[PDB]
A paper describes a structure:
Proton-coupled Oligopeptide Transporters (POTs) of the Major Facilitator Superfamily (MFS) mediate the uptake of short di- and tripeptides in all phyla of life.
The peptide binding site of DtpC is exposed to the cytoplasmic side. In the case of the here described DtpC structure, the IF state is open. Tight closure of both bundles above the binding site is mediated by a salt bridge between D43 (TM2, N-bundle) and R294 (TM7, C-bundle) and hydrogen bonds between H37 (TM1, N-bundle) and D293 (TM7) as well as R28 (TM1) and N421 (TM11, C-bundle). By replacing the phenyl group with a lysine side chain (generating the known DtpC dipeptide substrate Ala-Lys instead of Ala-Phe), we postulate a putative salt bridge between the carboxyl group of D392 and the ε-amino group of the lysine side chain. This observation, together with previous biochemical work allows us to hypothesize that the selectivity of DtpC for dipeptides with C-terminal lysine or arginine residues is caused by swapping a salt bridge between the recurrent carboxyl group of the peptide terminus and the transporter (R21Y mutation), to a side chain specific salt bridge with D392.
Residue numbers in the entry: 1 to 471
The structure:
Amino acid sequence: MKTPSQPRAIYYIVAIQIWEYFSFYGMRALLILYLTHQLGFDDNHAISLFSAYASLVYVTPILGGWLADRLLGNRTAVIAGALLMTLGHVVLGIDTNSTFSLYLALAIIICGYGLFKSNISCLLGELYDENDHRRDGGFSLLYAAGNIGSIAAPIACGLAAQWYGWHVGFALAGGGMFIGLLIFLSGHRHFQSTRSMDKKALTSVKFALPVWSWLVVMLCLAPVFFTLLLENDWSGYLLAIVCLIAAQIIARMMIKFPEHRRALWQIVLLMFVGTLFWVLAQQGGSTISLFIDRFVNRQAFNIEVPTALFQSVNAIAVMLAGVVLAWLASPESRGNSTLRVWLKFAFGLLLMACGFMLLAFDARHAAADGQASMGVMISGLALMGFAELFIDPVAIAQITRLKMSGVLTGIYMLATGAVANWLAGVVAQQTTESQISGMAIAAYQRFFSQMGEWTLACVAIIVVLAFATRF
């Protein structure tokens, strides 16, 4: 007999997954351009704020996962997260001229994203029995939904912003999130099997107060906390605490499972190298977006392409590459697995190097005309997108060889997200040592040349050690 179909609720989860990824990746395409053009931030300040936001959105999902586990259930937390992200995009759209509006909106979005990101996948995993064969198709479709939304959002938001200004771009992102929420809520009759909210826990009293009122207080104060954390650039102290906690978890883990201790060190070393990779990769939305805005010739068809659209190019490059390797998946995946892993990382770093070399070459030879060339930059972005398939999938495939691999996966994603984004913001300050003179193309040319050189240095070190340890 034919296999049973996917549980119909999947298609509503997919729908919200698209629209959330639409909103999140739309705002991300506009943000640094809005900070510079509308608000008149110096590049140092804009890059700092951007990287702080990009780290906190990788930090808060742990807290929202613990909240959905202990109190809310996954469905409630998904709904609340979508409401909060909608509210924050509406706040950002309604007033484009206060800066406090910006910080408040970003804090509200960070909270809603923290409630959403983990719990949407937990809710998808709740629909299947423990040995259901459909689960892999489910999660693959959810990943495809996220890729679709990541490709689609920078185009639509960029065009809407160009034609009507930043207000309508952010309003469009929020309307996307709201559409997705209404689609999800219309499917409620299919979710009746999923875990409801723990009414007994919420009606438990802790100190003088019922727990639900502590959630009300938290809903009020957490946006204030994150607003102050962003406005003062204090996110680094939180990131340091998170890193210290993760290090303690790993150390206790090293004691508890000494028969796997050396394997754990391999994962640690992977966490290091992948973090450095993502530092480079996170130049994509910050320094490279400013370079494209300022110094690339974007004229075509007697039209000018909005810089935000080039953020979609990366996503296309990732998705296409994902297909091709899937088209070419082959039984040669055997033998010295650790050496193969390290050579995959070396190849990804090499592709990242080539991307930065193409950007540096373009920014140098622009001097023949005065502006850089769209095709060489596009090629760099494409190569940088392709590089991403050889890092995180190989790392998670290596981690998932162990038990306890969910916590190590969480720690790996926390490092390569939050730490890599904060370090990317720190590194990007090297583009802006020449504040007094004004920005010039030579500063980006130096930055890209240095990034290429360091990438090839890391490639050489990895390859040399990996082969020297074979003999």
